[PDB]
Amino acid sequence: MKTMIYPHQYNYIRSVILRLKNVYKTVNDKETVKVIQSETYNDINEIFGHIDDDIEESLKVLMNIRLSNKEIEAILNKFLEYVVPFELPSPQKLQKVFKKVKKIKIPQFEEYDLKVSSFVGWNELASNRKYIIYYDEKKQLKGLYGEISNQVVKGFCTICNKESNVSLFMKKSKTNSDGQYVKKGDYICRDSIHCNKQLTDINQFYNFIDKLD
Amino acid sequence: GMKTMIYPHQYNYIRSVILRLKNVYKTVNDKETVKVIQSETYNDINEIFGHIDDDIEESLKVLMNIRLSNKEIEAILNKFLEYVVPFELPSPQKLQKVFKKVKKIKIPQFEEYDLKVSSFVGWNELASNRKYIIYYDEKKQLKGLYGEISNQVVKGFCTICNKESNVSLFMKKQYVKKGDYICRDSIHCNKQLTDINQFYNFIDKLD
Ligand SMILES: [Cl-]
Ligand code: NA
Ligand code: NA
Ligand code: NA
Ligand code: NA
Ligand code: NA
Ligand code: NA
Ligand code: NA
Ligand code: NA
Ligand SMILES: [Zn+2]
Ligand SMILES: [Zn+2]
């Protein structure tokens, strides 16, 4: 049985593999290549409690300076087999998370996209909203929405930490007994699917959520 | 103070090496490796400009500090963007000439930023399973082609930008055509394109 890994761990493995390939291609310093080779081997190896023969072979191929694009493709495809994809909730569970939102519905998602997703986010332009759903560390379905500005700028996304097309996302806290609430937020990728593909550390996502208060 | 003119792919390359350096600062804990990457990055950027100025000098100084921040990076990218000569969209009359056989042809609307990062312009017409591509050759002449783009999407390295992407088989428009896999989304393709020679080689290997 293949070890199960999370989508963000797959994204991380892909990231370090591509970083290594770029070092092979463009960095002429022998000792630097060795340092990055070792770092990459460790970065990938540490994800698994347990590496099997296929991963051992992939690592061997990765550690060769003649690593090719075709070889990378094959290795990425192999690593994808280990991923447990994001599980879209049933309509009844989704509605329980957004009890005050009538008629709510999550757009269809391609299977690869669920394999790289730590959360699912979609925009409803009519209401200028982004909806976000995810599971917490206890595997409970959670959801929120906020206003997403129409203005898009270049900046680093607060969730994935990559330089991207971002918009200001503002969430209202639950309204207290006196009708008062806090409204906080920050810039995040307008396109949450691309955001998820860029997300290699899920703690960044959870930190974003917590910062909304 | 006139700004040295650079090409969109050169800006993309500069952005690429800056992000690479930041990731080394953040994740690679080896003093000598950091210094090597710092020096390479400095050289990569300096060599693109040749003629620099006080703004570039200041940007390089900030980049060379291991405390480089995201906010500083965004500021530097915005400054460097000011040096780029964007892709020039052709007038409709000129576009017509390039595609004489195609009627009612019209380029989509493109954002200003997207033109600053574009070495070519590509768009899809799903009704005909077609991708159109326009570009300027090395003699600055406007050129265009189109072909069938498969509806099948796979993960793989793009023949144009050389990055791992969502690619589809493109066949330039009986006979056998093997095709080449390229990004379905040409705007994203362009953003990933840091070496113009890869694009030209792709063109050459069609025609
Ligand atoms: Cl290769
Ligand atoms: Na990394
Ligand atoms: Na790479
Ligand atoms: Na890299
Ligand atoms: Na790269
Ligand atoms: Na590079
Ligand atoms: Na990175
Ligand atoms: Na790391
Ligand atoms: Na080039
Ligand atoms: Zn993001
Ligand atoms: Zn491409």
Author numbering:
A (entry chain A): 10 to 222
B (entry chain B): 9 to 181, 189 to 222
Excerpt from the paper describing this PDB structure:
After optimization, crystals in space group P21212 diffracting to 1.6 Å resolution grew in polyethylene glycol at pH 5.5, and crystals in space group P1 diffracting to 2.3 Å resolution grew in polyethylene glycol at pH 8.1. The structure was solved using single-wavelength anomalous dispersion with P21212 crystals soaked in sodium iodide and refined against the native data. FusB crystallized as a dimer in the asymmetric unit of both crystal forms. The A molecule of the P21212 structure was fully ordered apart from the His-tag, whereas the other molecules displayed disorder in one or several loop regions. In the P21212 structure, we observed a continuous density across the domain interface between residues Ser15, Lys162 and Thr200 that we failed to interpret. Attempts to identify any bound ligand by mass spectrometry failed. Below, unless stated otherwise, the higher-resolution P21212 structure will be described. The two molecules in the P21212 crystal form superpose with a root-mean-square deviation (RMSD) of 0.41 Å for 200 CA atoms while the two molecules in the P1 crystal form superpose with an RMSD of 0.49 for 197 CA atoms. Beta strands S3–S5 form a non-canonical treble-clef zinc finger motif, where, in this case, a zinc ion is coordinated by four strictly conserved cysteine residues in a CXXC-X23-CX5C motif. The zinc site forms a small and rigid core that stabilizes the overall structure of the C-terminal domain and the interface to the N-terminal domain.
